[PDB]
Amino acid sequence: HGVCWIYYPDGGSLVGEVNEDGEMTGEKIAYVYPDERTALYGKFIDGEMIEGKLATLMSTEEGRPHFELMPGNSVYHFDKSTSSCISTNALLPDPYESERVYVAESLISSAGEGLFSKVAVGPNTVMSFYNGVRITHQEVDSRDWALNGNTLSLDEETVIDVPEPYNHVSKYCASLGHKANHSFTPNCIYDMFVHPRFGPIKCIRTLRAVEADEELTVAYGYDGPEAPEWYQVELKAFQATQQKHH
Ligand SMILES: N#Cc1cccc(C[C@@H](NS(=O)(=O)c2ccc3c(c2)CCNC3)C(=O)N2CCCC2)c1
Ligand SMILES: C[S@@+](CC[C@H](N)C(=O)[O-])C[C@H]1O[C@@H](n2cnc3c(N)ncnc32)[C@H](O)[C@@H]1O
C-alpha cells in the first residue's frame, strides 16, 4: 500500500497511508519529530492527532515506516491553546524536548531560571518548543507592559504568551521554550514549528554545535525604545567589555 510523508519546513513530518479522500485519516498514522526517530503513532483524522502513542521509528522499507511503541503509556492529542487555555494537560512533558533540555538556575547573574542542553547536538537542532496562550499584538501593546516578559511574536496577528502561574514548571511543563534567557552572543534562535499537539508555535533551534549542560540562549527581539531595564543594563555592560582595535 501507498504511504505519504509530509515534511514541515522545521524537519518534523506526518506519515501514513492516506484514505480514499486523500486525507491523513486512520489508526496507523504518525507524527515524526525532527530527529526522524521520536514519533507519536496512532489515530489521526485529516492529519489531526486524536491519540498519538509515544513510539520509535525503527526502520523504513521503501517508504513504509516500522514503529515500536514505547512502554509507559505516554499518549498525546491535538490541544491547540486559546487566549486563556494554555493546555488541557499542563504537566505532561513533550517527549522530544524532555530528552534534550532541562531547567535549572541560569548562569546569568539574577536572571532567574534558564534552559540547558541535556545532550551534545550539532548546529540547526530543534531543542525546545515555545508553546503558550494565543493573544493579539494589540492586546500585548494595550495592556500593562509588566505582563510582557514571556510574550513571543508568532506572526503579524498573534503573540504566544506563558502568563502567570504557567511560567513556573510546577504549574506548566508541557513545553519549556519560555525558560531560555537572552544573550547578545546567543547559541539558539526562535524558529517556526508545526507541532502535532500545540499546533503552529515557535521552537528553539541551535545556531551552532552545543555541548551537554551549556545554557541555551536567544537574542531577544526589542526594537531599544522602551526595552525592559534588565535588557538596557545588559546592552551597556556587554558593549563595555567588547575588545576594540586601537
Ligand atoms: N515590541 C515589543 C516587545 C514586547 C514584548 C516582548 C518583546 C520581546 C520579544 N520580542 S518579539 O517576540 O519580537 C515581540 C513580542 C511582542 C510584540 C512585538 C514583538 C511587536 C509589538 N507587539 C508586541 C522576545 O524576543 N521575547 C523572547 C522571550 C519572550 C519575549 C518585545
Ligand atoms: C522568557 S523568560 C526566560 C526565563 C526566566 N528567566 C524564568 O526564570 O522563567 C524572560 C524573563 O527572563 C529574565 N531574563 C532573560 N534574559 C535575561 C538576562 N540576559 N538578564 C537578566 N534577566 C533576564 C527577565 O526577567 C525576562 O522577563
Curated annotation (Swiss-Prot):
Domain of life: Eukaryota
Job of this protein: Histone methyltransferase that specifically monomethylates 'Lys-4' of histone H3. H3 'Lys-4' methylation represents a specific tag for epigenetic transcriptional activation. Plays a central role in the transcriptional activation of genes such as collagenase or insulin. Recruited by IPF1/PDX-1 to the insulin promoter, leading to activate transcription. Also has methyltransferase activity toward non-histone proteins such as CGAS, p53/TP53, TAF10, and possibly TAF7 by recognizing and binding the [KR]-[STA]-K in substrate proteins.
Record-marked site positions (Histone H3K4 binding): 130, 141, 151, 202, 220
Reaction catalyzed: L-lysyl(4)-[histone H3] + S-adenosyl-L-methionine = N(6)-methyl-L-lysyl(4)-[histone H3] + S-adenosyl-L-homocysteine + H(+); L-lysyl-[protein] + S-adenosyl-L-methionine = N(6)-methyl-L-lysyl-[protein] + S-adenosyl-L-homocysteine + H(+)
Tissue expression profile of the protein: Widely expressed. Expressed in pancreatic islets.
Reported impact of residue 130 to A: Significantly reduces the monomethyltransferase activity but increases the dimethyltransferase activity
Span of the entire protein shown here: 116 to 366 of 366
GO biological process, one term: regulation of DNA repair
Domain note: The SET domain is necessary but not sufficient for histone methyltransferase activity.
Primary localization class, coarse: nucleus
Domain SET: 99-221
GO cellular component terms listed in the entry, alphabetical order: chromosome; nucleolus; nucleoplasm; nucleus
Residues binding S-adenosyl-L-methionine: 111-113, 181-182, 234
EC number(s) given by UniProt: 2.1.1.364
The protein's name: Histone-lysine N-methyltransferase SETD7
Alphabetic keyword roster: Activator, Chromatin regulator, Chromosome, Methyltransferase, Nucleus, Repeat, S-adenosyl-L-methionine, Transcription, Transcription regulation, Transferase
Family (UniProt): Belongs to the class V-like SAM-binding methyltransferase superfamily. Histone-lysine methyltransferase family. SET7 subfamily.
Self-association state and partner proteins as the record states: Interacts with IPF1/PDX-1.
Localization terms from the record: Nucleus; Chromosome
Main enzyme class: transferase
GO molecular function: chromatin binding; histone H3 methyltransferase activity; histone H3K4 monomethyltransferase activity; histone methyltransferase activity; p53 binding; protein-lysine N-methyltransferase activity
